[PDB]
Amino acid sequence: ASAAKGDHGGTGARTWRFLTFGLALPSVALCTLNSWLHSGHRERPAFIPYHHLRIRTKPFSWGDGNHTFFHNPRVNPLPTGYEK
Amino acid sequence: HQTHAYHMVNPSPWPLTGALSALLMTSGLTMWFHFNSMTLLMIGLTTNMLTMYQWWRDVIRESTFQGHHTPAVQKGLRYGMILFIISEVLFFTGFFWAFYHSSLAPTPELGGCWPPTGIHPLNPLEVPLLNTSVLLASGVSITWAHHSLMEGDRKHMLQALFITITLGVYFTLLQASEYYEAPFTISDGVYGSTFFVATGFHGLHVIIGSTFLIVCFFRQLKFHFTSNHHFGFEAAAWYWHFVDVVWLFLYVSIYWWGS
Amino acid sequence: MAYPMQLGFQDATSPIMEELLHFHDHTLMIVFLISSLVLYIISLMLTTKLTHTSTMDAQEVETIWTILPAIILILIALPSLRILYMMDEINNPSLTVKTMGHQWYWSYEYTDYEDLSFDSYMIPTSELKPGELRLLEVDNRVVLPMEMTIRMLVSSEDVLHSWAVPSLGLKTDAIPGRLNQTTLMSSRPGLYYGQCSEICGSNHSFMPIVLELVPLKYFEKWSASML
Amino acid sequence: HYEEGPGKNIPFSVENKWRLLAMMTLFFGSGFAAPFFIVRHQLLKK
Amino acid sequence: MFINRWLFSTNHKDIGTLYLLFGAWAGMVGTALSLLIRAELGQPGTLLGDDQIYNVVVTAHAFVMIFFMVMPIMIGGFGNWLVPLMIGAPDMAFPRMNNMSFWLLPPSFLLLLASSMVEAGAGTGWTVYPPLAGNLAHAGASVDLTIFSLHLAGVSSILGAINFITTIINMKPPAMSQYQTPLFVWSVMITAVLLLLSLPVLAAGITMLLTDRNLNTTFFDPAGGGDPILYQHLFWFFGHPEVYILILPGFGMISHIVTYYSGKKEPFGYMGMVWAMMSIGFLGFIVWAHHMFTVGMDVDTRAYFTSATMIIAIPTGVKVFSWLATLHGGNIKWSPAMMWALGFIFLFTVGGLTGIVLANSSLDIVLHDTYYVVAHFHYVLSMGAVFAIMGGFVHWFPLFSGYTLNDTWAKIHFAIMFVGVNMTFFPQHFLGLSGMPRRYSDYPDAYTMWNTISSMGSFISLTAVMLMVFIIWEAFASKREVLTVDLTTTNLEWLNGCPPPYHTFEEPTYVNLK
Amino acid sequence: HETDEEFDARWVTYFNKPDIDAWELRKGMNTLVGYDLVPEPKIIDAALRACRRLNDFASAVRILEVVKDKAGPHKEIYPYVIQELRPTLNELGISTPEELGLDKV
Amino acid sequence: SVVKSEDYALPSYVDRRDYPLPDVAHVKNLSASQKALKEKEKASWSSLSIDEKVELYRLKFKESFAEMNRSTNEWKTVVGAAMFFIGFTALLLIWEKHYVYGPIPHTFEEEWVAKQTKRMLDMKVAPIQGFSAKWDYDKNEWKK
Amino acid sequence: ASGGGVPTDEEQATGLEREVMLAARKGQDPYNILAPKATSGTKEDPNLVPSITNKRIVGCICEEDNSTVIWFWLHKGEAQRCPSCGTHYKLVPHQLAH
Amino acid sequence: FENRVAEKQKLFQEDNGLPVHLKGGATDNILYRVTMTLCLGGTLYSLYCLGWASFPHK
Amino acid sequence: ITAKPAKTPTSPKEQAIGLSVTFLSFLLPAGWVLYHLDNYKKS
Amino acid sequence: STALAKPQMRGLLARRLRFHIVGAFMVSLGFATFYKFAVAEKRKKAYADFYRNYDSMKDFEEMRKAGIFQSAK
Amino acid sequence: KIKNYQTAPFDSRFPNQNQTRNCWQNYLDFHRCEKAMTAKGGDVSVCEWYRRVYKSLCPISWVSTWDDRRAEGTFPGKI
Amino acid sequence: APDFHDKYGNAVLASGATFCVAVWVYMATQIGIEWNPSPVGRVTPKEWR
């Protein structure tokens, strides 16, 4: 339960810098590439006015009361469907 | 003259201003939710920030500049930080209990399934996996910073701490983008509720932890920390590891198992 | 129903409530004996000028006062759990009745055969017929066949309520989105009263339950006449 | 520094027992009266 | 100087005094609310003519007594005065954060008063269950002000728990182990651990209630896939630890009082007392669903919660019998504080036993949401807390103030209160067994006799509370200054005189390790 | 923990120490009256003679009072102990509390 | 004699029957005749008079056991005053009934109760023990 | 890699923290961080109790593992005895600081 | 930059009787007055808001 | 406990005044509200 | 002039405790027999006697003739 | 076979106090059966057991709302 | 010297008891409180239908 690395004898700053630049930041760079390759907008699904979604029991305290705080017109329909 | 090692604190106005800031924030949220006005809330947020700034400023004055943090005082502050983190763990435990309650027993209104009918979860292998690598990496770089500081290496402490902060900011910006791009919202039933309230309080804690690391960065630029005495840095690192571990549990529970 | 100056439980209408009565008698005897023993030992400790103020060794007497309470707890828990699982045992009902809580009245649905449903409201005090009970009568009683196992299903169409009939030993919360099941069997005909038992707002005090237990043939004809 | 000793380690004066009686009367009496005036207030609204 | 001392305090004794004053004022509010409850019920029919107001009075009664009277007096008041003195510490670990725990409470109380003044109040019960507490059945600001009142009280107590745990672990003399600290200090440490773990779960649940009411979440709303029963689990996961939080400092004070007025150097069975409080604290986290036996719970879960609940009687009995064993052989001083403590032992025992009745879920089906539960907890909680508070207050008033009470008046006060609380609550057992629901503004006529008697009892305790205020006035009016206190060799908090100087233990105690 | 006679003998030895000091006299008596017993006459005798070596008449009388107090409602014990002590009381000129009027309220 | 507040850290005098020999003498300062009395105490106590012996006792101690253990009449004051204040409470309840409470519901009228009682017996309320069990349906009267 | 620039406690500790550090270096405990070790506690070998004033509270744990601590003021002058176990303590006033 | 901690240690240890929250100099007093004024003024305003919200309006 | 005699003794008459004032401070405002309940409910 | 006999002088509190705890136990056992006879068994016999010859249809007919039911005249 | 329906029998799939899922499952089963029998021909009469069971157990308002949502195209279960 | 209790205890006990019984009996019986005791042995049942 310790990966396949293995370099001790008096832990220190030099080893944790080695891990930072040799394992941790390369992994971030790999996941960044993976993410940037699967990016791009996907086709939004048909709108269906499901009653368990788009809940409105009280108007929101901003805007017109009917838009969520990080409303994205492209992918977040209102209770009455997508905005034009 | 005392002959114990503990700190008798000068009489202070910040407890009262912090309490009044809490009154103004809460009455302010009430005014915003029910009386269409942000005024009280803005005043309360401002006085809260002023209180935090002057209070922790004074703690730096009492310790770096006046010498009151003997080993006994520092040990108390270690216990205090550990106990504070434990209370924050239990706060998150309440939101995880809500998530598992709703997802392990999906009601008919959802379609009787999880994720609910009509919910299209984010792909956990895209930006959520990137966010995981980013916070895990920041736990490695903050450990490098801690060892550099203990070994008396100013430049590499600053480099490693800057990288840690940069990753915290990267996470925050990625999560903000994910919030904007998500096709479901907080109003999308219990899926949106659990998703945004649990990840949203976690995001708040990333912002708090990042701010705390930034405070440590500037104190380090100003030579406050010695190679053996730097509890503010240790507390910020403990808090940062807490934020990282809460993220791993959100990733596994909500993003992966809950997809 | 309760009667004036009543000290204990209503008389049992159902076998399960009779079991509860005997279990309560058993447990109350224990409660009385322990509360009296503590009061008596207090008085014993406080009624002598003799003293002994040096350190007293504890571990011997702490065996007695953990083991004997554990034994007492076991003697409560054994019949307690027997009744719990007897309650839960399979009964095979011959009728299902639903009740829905509302602010502030109950509705009932008998939909095994025909679509029968109705609302049940408290009789206002100013409209009580002579000899009727203030706050307990309803306009439309829950008529049920006596001597028969009935499945009650309990829910709500607004806030929480709770459907209770003390003399049958029944209390089942009424929760929107949830269908809670309990079983009911009256050994006798008659009128059996209960009251909403989860605070549900301004008129929580004023939405009672009245069961009317009669022979099957009367229940059948009543049901048909209520369609 | 601060005053120490009986009567001095409290945020209210006990130098005059009748002024104290008034102050204690106002203090405990205002807390006891408040719920009665909250009820009156809610009754008068509707 | 006045502002620096009393608004900018960093002193554990002055902060303790602030809490005792706040808690006594809250007690007046909570008592007035209780008299309105009993006035509505003292004859059949309607008094207020407005049951939403009745429900608001009941709700506010409980929040005031729990969060503004008992916890501030026990933990803020006796805890801050006594804990640093009993371990020879020069103050709390975080003396300035301690002052914020105090000053969050007046705003918290202001929010609760605000909730009752706006709209029609929060007529919810102190449980605040949805959907009654949601934005359709309680539209408007009242329930949100209640939620925010609880948030501030919760922050006050979480920070206070951090303070107490840190102080007790870290600031004892170096030779003093945890098994050489007095029982009241143990009782505060354990209460603080319970607060630290339980209050964040309440904060999560009431925050989810706040967002269902204002942000269109649906944690508790079946229309979105939510569940009202989830709120009940989160509330009572806090709420059962909370009832032990309300009594544990009381147990600690009772141990000291019974030891002192028995003329003993020590309580009987110290390590058993420590074990018992730790065991009660631990078991107090695994029993909460006995507040939910009628919600539609599976039989095997009912059997588990029945059984785990009953086991708490074992450590609790060790404490009761150990208090009796402390009296045994004592040179008994029949002081007023001793009378409070002996009233506590008996009344707590009665209440705890009716709790064991309720633990049996089969009987709880018939007793839940009736006056039997109200009778249970006004014995074990309301009388338990109030009698331990009055015992501690009478016993330590000369330490805090430097002046003595009139002991004859204090015994008269005890006698009146003992009659009053028992007349008030004992008949409520009959009302519950015979099926009267709680949270009702009126009752079927059969229940009239015991409701009448109960409400007459409530006025007797009112007379006792008025007399208590007079007795405190008379002590400060007459100024009998303390001279000699017995048994200081085993009661360290008295050894610096009465009142102790502003700074104590500037030179720490000397304790050898042998 | 030991036999009655061994307990008594340790206490007799305690008070018979020739150069017992005032502090030890008081420690001894204040410790002894914590036990569940009225001290045997032979213990009281040794304590009274310690009072004599310490030129403390008043504490000798007080010790007689605490024997009567430790007997509680057993009114037969104190006159028995005084009876057994009379030769020592006479030898040392110790008056009983009763002879001094110190039993009056 | 005079105990002062500033003496709180010094060994003190107490009269307690479980602490018979306190840490200090009741009287510390001696007059000329009291000094001579303490010198005489070094000789045979048989040569002390009763009054001298009492005086030596009262220099050492404040109260005797009989004095410090005396019973008092305080219980009469306590019980009597408690009953006065409980009596005063009934005045408050009288005031409340007169000025606060209006009439109770019409279901408490005698005729209503008599009819309601008959209907309770007709529906056999609590027929095993509680209520109708006490009615004799054969004799049409309450059982004796 | 490596490098300096981080102050040490020796360089930059101040105030009471620095007093405690310098005293510890000399094996001294003016701020009472350590538990004192008992002597045999006889009248010839009393426990020596430092103080900056002429009285200090002693807590005596008379026997190992007693839970009850016996507290009393120890005054300058002749050794005093614990009222429970009799072991002796003698105040050694003053010094420590200026 | 440069390690100026010793200069701040001298400033905050000066024997001038000032409490720590004012010991940095005149800007501490300004910031304190701003904070306390906003707090007390905000609290008075919250009380006005309570008075307004305590009664029905159209 | 022992204590000094009162520095400012409160005589029986003075106690009767303090007691009566204390009781009136609790009873008069609440009594006024409860006496006028009808006046409030009919508004 | 008769000497007094030596009375018991040791363990008087413990001896009192033992005697009355035994007495407490005996009383508790006595109350338990009274309570089982006066309450628990009384209730068992009352329900058993009630139901031994109980005729539910006869009880219904009595109630019906008294006019108590909505569903039966 | 085995008719004379009185009420819905005990169902070991749903043995506990909460019977929501029993109502829900039988409502789904009836409507899935009905859809199947309508498309490929046949008679809904073979779906009758599910019909009687969900009618016995389900609150009228639940059935009504679910029916309305099937007609609207917003029913979230699979049929 | 006799204290307050020696001088006045007898009168406080006697007067307080006499006052308490008199005012509770008056409250209980003379001002119209309806205690609603059991009808058993007290009420003659009357036809209602």
Ligand code: HEA
């Ligand atoms: C001081 C606060 C306090 C304390 C300490 C307790 C202690 C206990 N309580 Fe109580 N309780 C409340 C305050 C408290 N409670 C409150 C406020 C509520 C309701 C809140 C609401 O709904 O608003 C409540 C509700 C409540 C319920 C839910 C009832 C319902 O709503 O239907 C239950 C159920 O099991 C319960 C049980 C117990 C038990 C078993 C104990 C045990 O810890 C008691 C153990 C003590 C003893 C048993 C006595 C001493 C023991 C001996 C002498 C030994 C020998 C005894 C035996 C062998 C039995 N409590």
Ligand code: HEA
């Ligand atoms: C600590 C908790 C506490 C206390 C002390 C009390 C005290 C009292 N309560 Fe209680 N009560 C609750 C907690 C408490 N209550 C709770 C949790 C509920 C449930 C609410 C709900 O249903 O949601 C409740 C509900 C409740 C009801 C049921 C309402 C209903 O179901 O409709 C009743 C009815 O009689 C009642 C009456 C009283 C009375 C008459 C008193 C007292 O008048 C009795 C006498 C006691 C006092 C007068 C205390 C005075 C103390 C001080 C003045 C402090 C002094 C300070 C110092 C010395 C420093 N209460």
Ligand SMILES: CCCCC/C=C/C/C=C\C/C=C\C/C=C\CCCC(=O)O[C@H](COC(=O)CCCCCCCCCCCCCCCCC)COP(=O)(O)OCCN
């Ligand atoms: C991304 C970075 C943004 C800048 C930094 C912001 C920090 C905010 C931190 C505090 C958050 C605290 C409360 C959290 C409540 C919910 C917010 C959840 C996270 C979030 O931001 O949720 C989003 C906004 O939601 C929303 O309502 C936003 C609602 C805004 C009001 C939030 C605060 C409401 C009151 C909270 C009271 C909390 C009390 C806590 C007490 C704790 C114990 C003392 C979701 O956007 P959406 O448009 O629905 O969906 C995306 C669709 N494309």
Ligand SMILES: CCCCCC/C=C/CCCCCCCCCC(=O)O[C@H](COC(=O)CCCCCCCCCCCCCCC)COP(=O)(O)OC[C@@H](O)CO
């Ligand atoms: C973007 C703006 C966001 C605004 C809102 C959130 C604001 C919070 C900002 C984040 C927190 C900043 C905390 C700064 C603390 C600075 C003071 C400090 O770090 O003080 C240290 C002590 O630690 C101490 O008190 C440690 C004290 C505890 C600090 C805990 C901080 C985390 C908790 C914050 C609140 C979270 C609330 C969450 C609610 C959901 C000083 O001791 P040392 O470091 O050893 O130095 C001495 C040596 O120099 C001697 O040689």
Ligand SMILES: CCCCCCCCCCO[C@@H]1O[C@H](CO)[C@@H](O[C@H]2O[C@H](CO)[C@@H](O)[C@H](O)[C@H]2O)[C@H](O)[C@H]1O
């Ligand atoms: C539950 C807590 C309280 C319980 C018990 C309260 C006991 C009451 C004490 C007296 O209260 C006063 O009673 C007066 C009547 O006796 C009222 O005067 C009222 O009635 C008088 C005539 O009866 C008029 O002269 C006044 O103007 C009119 O205000 C008066 O306002 C009220 O202060």
Ligand code: CUA
């Ligand atoms: Cu419906 Cu309470």
Ligand SMILES: [Cu+2]
């Ligand atoms: Cu509980």
Ligand SMILES: [Mg+2]
């Ligand atoms: Mg309930």
Ligand code: NA
């Ligand atoms: Na009423």
Ligand SMILES: [Zn+2]
């Ligand atoms: Zn010792």
